[PDB]
Write a protein that binds this ligand. Structure first.
Ligand SMILES: *[C@@H]1O[C@H](CO)[C@@H](O[C@@H]2O[C@H](CO)[C@@H](O)[C@H](O)[C@H]2NC(C)=O)[C@H](O)[C@H]1NC(C)=O
Ligand SMILES: *[C@@H]1O[C@H](CO)[C@@H](O)[C@H](O)[C@H]1NC(C)=O
Lengths: 50, 105
C-alpha cells in the first residue's frame, strides 16, 4: 500500500505537471467539507500489488 | 518580485521570484501569502539579478510545464519605438499557474 495513484480530478493534467494537492473530491451537489461520503471521495487510491 | 500560483494559500505549489540587487532567488514550494516583504520544496534557483528614463519590459509564459521569462532594459510611458526582447530563462517548474501578483519593497 506504499504506492498511490490519483483517481479523481476536476480537469485533465497538463504535460509534465505535478499535482500533489490532496482535497476531497466533489462528485455531487452538497459540499464534502473534508468528510468522505456520498459523492465525496478521497482522490488518492492505493495500489494493491500482490 | 513576483508570486504565481492557483490559490496561493499553501494548498498548491506557488512560484516565488525575488530580487535583492545581488542575486535572483526562485522557488516553487507553497506558503500563505500576504502582500509584500518588508525592509516540501522541490525546485530552487539562484541566478544573477534582473536589475540595472529606463524602461524594463518582461514577458512571462507557461508552456508545457516550462516557465519562460524574456526581458529587455532600454533607455527612453511606452514610446512609439520598436525594441525586441531577449530570453533570460526557461525553468522546468511544471505547475498550474492561473493567478499572480507583484512584490514591492
Ligand atoms: C488550474 O487551476 C484552475 C483553478 O482551479 C483550474 O480551473 C478550474 O477548472 C475546472 C475544470 O476545468 C473548473 O470546474 C473550475 O471552476 C476551474 N476553476 C477556476 C477558479 O476557474 C484549471 O483547470 C487548472 N489547470 C489545469 C490544466 O487543470
Ligand atoms: C508537504 O507538507 C505536508 C505537511 O507538512 C506533508 O504531509 C507532506 O508529506 C509534504 N510533502 C512531501 C513530499 O514530503
Amino acid at each position: 500500500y506504499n504506492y498511490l495513484y490519483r483517481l479523481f480530478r476536476k480537469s485533465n493534467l497538463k504535460p509534465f505537471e505535478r499535482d500533489i494537492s490532496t482535497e476531497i473530491y466533489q462528485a455531487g451537489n452538497k459540499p464534502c467539507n473534508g468528510v468522505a461520503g456520498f459523492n465525496c471521495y478521497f482522490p488518492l487510491r492505493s495500489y494493491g500489488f500482490r | 518580485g513576483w508570486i504565481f500560483g492557483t490559490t496561493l494559500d499553501s494548498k498548491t505549489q506557488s512560484l516565488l521570484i525575488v530580487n535583492n540587487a545581488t542575486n535572483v532567488v526562485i522557488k516553487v514550494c507553497e506558503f500563505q501569502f500576504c502582500n509584500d516583504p518588508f525592509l516540501n520544496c522541490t525546485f530552487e534557483y539562484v541566478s544573477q539579478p534582473f536589475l540595472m528614463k529606463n524602461l524594463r519590459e518582461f514577458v512571462f509564459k507557461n508552456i508545457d510545464g516550462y516557465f519562460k521569462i524574456y526581458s529587455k532594459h532600454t533607455p527612453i510611458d511606452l514610446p512609439q519605438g520598436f525594441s525586441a526582447l531577449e530570453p533570460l530563462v526557461d525553468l522546468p517548474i511544471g505547475i498550474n499557474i492561473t493567478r499572480f501578483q507583484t512584490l514591492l519593497a
